[model samples]
Target: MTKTLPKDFIFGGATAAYQAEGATHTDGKGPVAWDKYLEDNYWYTAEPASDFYHKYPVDLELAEEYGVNGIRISIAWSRIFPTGYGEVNEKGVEFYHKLFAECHKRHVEPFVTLHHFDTPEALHSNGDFLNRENIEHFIDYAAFCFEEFPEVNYWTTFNEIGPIGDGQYLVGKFPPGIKYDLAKVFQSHHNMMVSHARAVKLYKDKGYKGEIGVVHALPTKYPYDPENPADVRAAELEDIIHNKFILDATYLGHYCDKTMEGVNHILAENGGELDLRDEDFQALDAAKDLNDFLGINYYMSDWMQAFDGETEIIHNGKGEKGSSKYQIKGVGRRVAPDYVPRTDWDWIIYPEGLYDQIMRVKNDYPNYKKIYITENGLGYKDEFVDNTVYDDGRIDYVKQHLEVLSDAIADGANVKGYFIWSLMDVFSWSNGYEKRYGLFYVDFDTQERYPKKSAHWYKKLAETQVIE
Candidate 1:
């Protein structure tokens, strides 16, 4: 058996509002871009997804019963302020207040994220995050949240802000699916950074007694062939875009010329330039040193091949969340025959990569005091029999990752906690409900929650405080 983590380390799960909380239009909730996207597009599976809005109490009960003491849940911006920013909807505000209150009732720590790509349809139609004015609006929304949720001791301004560019302006598959525009993508990122910084500063200036930061959806990259120069260069480029982009903005406070080297060439070649302003830097600078901890959602690692003038968007998963192929857009593409095991959707499993990434953050960021594995889980289609989903694959998947994470902590990676990707199976934006990644099994139709094998396995581990 492995040694137990520090008693204070958090062991919990995570869920996003749009994916998990249904009632997309219920109770004064305004339409977000995701709801609009589902209406506008065809062949995309969605709507009234998880129905968690009505099922949260039961789900939160399941979380407490599963032996976890913390949860990282996203607050739907549109839910709190239906139009993204305006007069608060009392009912929408009441929903979250009640949700957190119940979590507290169950002795669960709440780690709240303000945005998780559920951009309210109202603000989104007005150029979404591209327009600079949305930055201040985000600050208003953030301030409202902090004031309302005083018991929420951990907060994040943005969730996975790294890939907005790839989805909205690059590949155009994800929500607010815009066509390829290099300039718009870069500027959108800047606006998001400014908004994040402003919110972080506000959290501190308001004298809230909690930690605030950004949660990154990270996919570490490895060289396609470490021996080849092109592969090496491409891998470096991919790592910069995938990992460093947010790391620099949130932690380093500005873009690194060395890391973002070829970005200028790509922009100039396409007659596009980075639209950065002095205010953007000043905004980032003000809160550069304010980030409390690094939040990571690790699923899989990618392999990159240097662009030999290749600009095609080659995605490993055709219709899933990793659809951005975020870092692979222009600089590099995925390397095949991943050395590690993979799930049904080509999501390669590399627990060692998880360990490597954890240490990489500690080694790279000297000031980083805490690291939270905000999300890490395996998605699989399990057979249902006898009211039990015997998902040994998921059990093994989690056990392997935890072992690696345990190793990281023992080696002095200040890992504060681990939260599984989801508490219950929810709506997968692209794949509909076919891909399940929850410790608890969720039936989409009647909204019944069942415990999977991993659920019991994790419960045992949580109670035993050892991985055998």
Candidate 2:
């Protein structure tokens, strides 16, 4: 028996601008938040990552050998516009041109994400997201990208808006980190929506024939106890917090009533309120038609229960911690107990969660044209032994997730593609190079590239076009 994807299903890999490309300041590239973050403190354990900025050719060849049909990569806006606006960098533009050409040569399509959490530090100093002019600057950056890389059809406007906002305003994990302010949060969120809309319109006006959407990191809420009303309430709030705030605005052209109420309550408690100008509402209302599809970065799902006024410390897979007043008790994720596990710095393993997530999106947001699994894969602590790297854990992780995805397709979801989290285990944002998620491992010490055993498994799976 053979279990293969539909004839048109896309199998691919993904990587980001700052994570993979170590030549942070080379080729006329400007400094981004990650560059500054690393320089100030050694966040990423390794000094120089895989050096994908200069070693892209070697990695591209590896992707080709793995039979990948597509790849998701990011273009550092600061790399092109050093000051965040004005004067395009020719050398920076040339790097992407060569990259897309190489992908075309290997019969692989390229999916480009315009911004992936590493904004230009210059933008931050000038009020960052709070500045309305930042929307125009983002549009200009998108136009430059569309013009430079015409062959790349897929575009993700922003990677993870909620996390981005949280990092910048509430948590202080990312650069320009500030304390929690409801006004700044609302303002930044609204601005990002407007920016996405402007970029989509700009692409349309320029006659670009491709798909454009924003990548949302969705956290599905499962009630701690299905029959418990309090648990159900918590789950509902979780949905409003994680999914509806972004989805409703983007797809439905309005905010979810519950989410708006929550925001209003927070504002009231702080003795401040969102100053929703008529123009702001108009811009948000107009963004409903801005996207051609929905891009999802699915990892794990969590269970929640209602909490009193008290708060709990929030922790990400990276073990970074913070506190949230929006009370919800976590009951852990749903995954088999017997499965072998490895955390790229403590990220839990839950492959089947991918299926549940896809189904939820398909059923809940039926208005979305098509769905793309933009980022999915696990990070592992890898070791190089005797001139070869063995990463069985990562291979199993991909296989399990792919199996769940195959089942999703058979059940009538309009999922058209799957791009593994990364092509090479480059630099993990905060945890750095210690956490590897690539099929081909790079020797950071000597800059030599070696294909791990998992790479061979992926190649066979890709060539066979069958999961089993």
Candidate 3:
């Protein structure tokens, strides 16, 4: 049995700009799409989100003491370019420099991300990544980061492109909440892949002396009735939209015939068309073999059955158990098997999916050099009692995932790291502060930090690298 990770494995934690660092209105930071969306729709705000903006030093200190050797941190695009393209914000640049320096001081390597779900409101109002012009703006922003922050060695171009589209168009949980727009969903995903391709090619062409990759949330899709052809076909269609389409673009530099066949079928069913350009493939082909690593963010898997009903999806953002529904017209419906467990937020718990995804990349995408579990954790309603949290469920969730990770490595996948979804309790996008995923619990009102029982367990895992 595999009990320990490799000696050089990066056991780390993760945080995003809009999710972790709270100083949303201070120091000339520009507004992101979430700023107004939260105000107009939801009751909660993003201000003082763990307040990592002012308390990064303290967090870094805790990381060092906890034996965490690497951390995933994202740079807010609006923070650097207040309007997404106009004047530069020097203070934003300075803040990141200090943040990276603090990580170095504590011996925790910083894996930086350029964009993580927070497009500048100015650009988002203009069609976000769907507009071809906005893609250029993204490339320009990436070039500026490559020039400015040479201190960051590991970099990712974007985070979870598919989820971003799903939230914006399909499920309608994010900004510009429009539901069941299949065309926009497919178009936005393609454009972002093109943007990612351009940025990766640019970083390599410039010889930036570092690494660059892209993060994709790969939740393995299974057919509910494997013996039925219709059910199998439904699962394949959804998988193409969610996994294979982007995976092919990321590695093959062009959509494979199999993927395009499924894509065309779904688009036709929904009266949609994709405006694919030849130049986009040129950029993708150039960067096909350029990614230094592949960041796989696995949370949960979905089982699909054939369905011909209208699109219906109920986002359980309030941790309402057994109150979620997801049925796409002409695609399929998601089913939660009674055998598999789930969280209060209705996320299906299946660690075998992680192993399957890692092995799939290893077997299918030959150009992939390395892999990282960029984000994986259980979001639970952690109770704060006596200044600390006793989250046994969170500990078991991570333990199960890590055990599968070890199996993947032993089976020939070159996975170099595993970073949990969060370092400290950060703001969740769809779900508010209640759905917490952190080794260290944060008192949201007081802004004070306290270690949970899982923190000590994780400290041991990092030091010994043993799953037990």
Overall lDDT per candidate, in order of appearance: 0.79, 0.73, 0.91
Candidate 1 lDDT tens digits, 1-468: 565766777889899989988887689988877775655673544556777788888988989998988888889888888887778899988989898998899888999999988888888888888877777788899998899888798999888876777777866767666655666766777788789999999889999989998888788888888998888877777676557766777777788886667566556654576778788888888887888988988887877877655365644444343443433345656755534666656778887878888877888787777889998887766677777799888888878888888889899998888899788898876566777889888877778988988888888888776875
**Pairs of residues clashing in candidate 2:** none
lDDT of candidate 3 vs native?
0.91
Candidate 2, residues 183-258: lDDT per residue as tens digits? Answer: 5666677778778877777787778888888888886667677898867766765566556677777877767778
Model 2 TM-score on a 0 to 1 scale: 0.90
Question: Of the candidates shown, which would achieve the greatest TM-score relative to the real structure?
Answer: 3
lDDT string, candidate 3, 72-113, tens digits: 999999999999997899999999999999999999999999
Instruction: Pick the winner on lDDT between candidates 1 and 3.
Output: 3
What's the distance in Å from true for residue 415, model 3? 0.7
Supply the TM-score for candidate 3: 0.99
